[PDB]
Point group: C2
Chain length 490, copies 2
């Protein structure tokens, strides 16, 4: 029988076909990269088997990898010598602790309780657990009587999700089903979970629901939490605080909102002392306390109509957001009604160069008209790549200025300027806009060369406007104009 | 040439060998699961190529999967029909949006800028970016001149890490190297990064360093952040607050600590209003403001020696932790000096049953002595599995009581009782302890049956004590004792 763990043995010889798909799925794999002629790799094989049939009840993994035939997999894994007992934990293909401890069953049986991962916490009285075990972590919990599509979804998710929650799987069987989520703020009030189950027994379904409900109705907005506030899709309404009397005068109201509109939009507070400077980033003046919504999906900010500047300095009395106003904003937004507020800077009373500095207000207009074939540099004043560009962009624009004006070549600063139309997250985004005879979603993708745009602006151009030919014709005309020949010779 | 993207083409025909290892490594894969005889899958192949050689500059993935020969991979992926243009984003093997948009190069070239992932943010003036772009997210940034082991580590990590930071890769080339981390609290002070580089150009190396330095020296302790506060290994020192005068009287001091001891131990605050109930969980009375350390690695809590109870109620004046005391604790701990504090309840003046209820104070003692072979149930009063046990445990203990006392059978409540010795995270942990003639790390693993322990306690027992034989002998003796026969017959 040599060194095989045969078909009858309680082990699955993982092959090269998919070591990694098997590893990273399983919560805690125990490998054995081995060779057959290695006496030791035979001369402890009954022990691997004896720590096999017995060790499946804490579903332990036995994994013989015949590095003879499964050779190319020994490459993607830095094997020292045979037998190799590098055993993987959370189960990525990095953590490979080459365990040099005993090669017995009754020995290493114990080492499978080296990192016991008790994710699920079965209880008799939750009251106790909940109160004996205080924690900053919200906890998922189920009681009642557990379905099949559940023990290995609830235990499953948890198993690979302590980076997130506490996972009690309690079951006072004399009880109908249940799936609460005890949030660290108000534990009195857990989660009314509506029971469509067989579909909410997988990810991203089971998942998205935690991603929704595991967020404290009205918590603070850490850098940390702000991740999963955006892993949401729900527009969050930011409120700014100066004092905590200011926080806690408001803190009930927003909880009560977030409760009703739970699934539609989110809510957070935000110390204004450390983040007044965000205010504008939500198109909003630094007057506090400041409530504002942000449609994260399409980049649209809605503020509670902030008070005027020519009464800002003149205002010793403080600032107060009447609840009545707070709601009416929220409802509006969701009705598809509230006013979003672009940052049109003041419109440039015609100044220097052939590159038109554009604004939100005009942009909507100028980009359209069929006269002319306007190109647009959507930009911000800081990035490296968007400034090593305006030099070309000028000697680009200048070439078209002189020649039959027509094709406008313009730039628009996305700092202090929202645009309703098309955009990439990052700058310098470049776009050409023919007009109302044909569409304007004609995004520039390529190099920076004067050359490459001159292509584009004719190639993908309504008028078919050979700017290069100009840049030929032009440089010739400026080669002669100066030199007078007759000055002197030789 | 039929429908092959040949060796000369700008595409890599991913095979079944490892689709997934290729997918989940790459930030944004664009698949084409195809068959050769599918006219359309030939009749748009030059377009895949024409959107190949040109589209590698935003390293786009072209992936032909010949579902003829790579068939078993079509199973692990729910293919509709040929050609299939299910293109994967963040790149797990779930998100498979079967894109039915155009089958041209100059068309779908654009759709590779559908989810542009500008992770890196190149800038000319960081000052602007930093200030124009306010955010709750700390930002990693490098200037100077970037090494090879860096663009595709910095860009790399980021690429799959917006769930964490903002990643500016700026480079005012006229400058020596640099890797700061601008933390959202004090941006004035970024990160003095010490320059051993070629090693800090990988994970978990580059990683662990963010995992260290990206945490605000002295932030609050959200449920969220508490994850990565434990993904650390650094003991964090918790301080509790009642007021913010109480917070901000202390808030400078702890920052200054966390700065010096940056790598050794961490620091956080914690509203006592919502979490007084944790206090005990750090072996600590609910007197506030309360500073305490927690050695997360070995479960050891160190408090600033909280004031007495018989002067608790008598104390109208408030509570104050003198800085001088705060430091001296920290130093001590790190010297390997400070006192950790077990929760020994009061020692049970001999009461009811054959199961000895143990305490921290005694436990150290009783577990040891060679007389006798003590078994120990390490437990908590709530879990399901640890109470469906004491019934056996009694009719276990009783069997040994009557018979030559010797082997003690005991239980120890881990709620209101720390144990210095061996433990599993979860209960009911069971252990037998012979003594000073042989070691005591003899952990019970198995069923609950009276049977299984009776094995254990002899099998792995110093005295070799057949309890089963008793449980034979015993039940016989209680079969006779009662029935008097002569009462009546028939």
């Amino acid at each position: 029988q040599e060194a095989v763990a045969p078909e009858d043995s309680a082990v699955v010889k993982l092959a090269t076909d998919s070591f990694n798909e098997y590893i990273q799925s399983h919560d805690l794999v125990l490998a054995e990269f081995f060779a057959p002629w290695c006496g030791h790799c035979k001369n402890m094989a009954p022990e691997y088997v004896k720590a096999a049939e017995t060790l499946v009840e804490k579903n332990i993994t036995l994994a013989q990898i015949d590095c003879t035939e499964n050779q190319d997999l020994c490459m993607e894994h830095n094997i020292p010598g045979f037998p190799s007992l590098k055993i993987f934990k959370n189960s990525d293909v990095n953590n490979s602790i080459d365990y040099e401890g005993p090669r017995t069953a009754e020995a290493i049986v114990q080492f499978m309780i080296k990192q016991s991962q008790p994710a699920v916490a079965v209880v008799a009285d939750l009251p106790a657990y909940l109160a004996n075990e205080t924690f900053v972590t919200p906890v998922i919990v189920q009681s009642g009587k557990i379905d099949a599509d559940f023990n290995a979804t609830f235990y499953s998710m948890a198993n690979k999700h302590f980076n997130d929650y506490d996972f009690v799987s309690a079951e006072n069987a004399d009880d109908d089903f249940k799936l609460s989520i005890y949030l660290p703020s108000a534990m009195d009030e857990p989660v009314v979970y509506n029971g469509k189950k067989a579909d909410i027994a997988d990810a991203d379904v089971f998942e998205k629901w935690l991603q929704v409900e595991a967020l404290p109705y009205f918590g603070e907005i850490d850098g940390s939490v702000f991740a999963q506030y955006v892993e949401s899709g729900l527009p969050l309404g930011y409120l700014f605080y100066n004092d905590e009397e200011e926080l806690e005068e408001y803190k009930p109201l927003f909880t009560e909102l977030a409760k009703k509109n739970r699934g539609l939009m989110n809510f957070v507070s935000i110390d204004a002392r450390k983040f007044g400077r965000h205010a504008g980033n939500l198109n909003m003046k630094e007057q506090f306390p400041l409530f504002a919504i942000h449609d994260m999906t399409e980049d649209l900010k809605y503020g509670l109509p902030q008070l005027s500047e020519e009464a800002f300095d003149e205002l010793s009395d403080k600032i107060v957001l009447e609840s009545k106003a707070i709601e009416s904003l929220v409802k509006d937004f969701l009705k598809g009604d509230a006013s979003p507020i672009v940052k049109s800077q003041e419109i440039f009373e015609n100044q220097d160069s052939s590159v038109f500095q554009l604004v939100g207000k005009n942009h909507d207009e100028i980009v359209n008209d069929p006269k002319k074939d306007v190109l647009v540099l959507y930009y911000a004043p800081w990035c490296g790549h968007c400034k090593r560009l305006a030099p070309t962009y000028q000697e680009l624009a200048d070439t078209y200025a002189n020649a039959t004006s027509d094709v406008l070549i313009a730039k628009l600063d996305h700092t202090e300027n929202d645009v309703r139309g098309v955009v990439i997250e990052g700058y310098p985004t470049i776009v050409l806009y023919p007009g109302g005879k044909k569409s304007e979603s004609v995004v520039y993708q390529g190099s920076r060369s004067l050359d490459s745009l001159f292509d584009f602006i004719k190639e993908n151009g309504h008028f078919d406007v050979d700017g290069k030919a100009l840049y030929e014709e032009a440089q010739e005309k400026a080669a002669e104009e100066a030199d007078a020949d007759a000055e002197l010779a030789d």
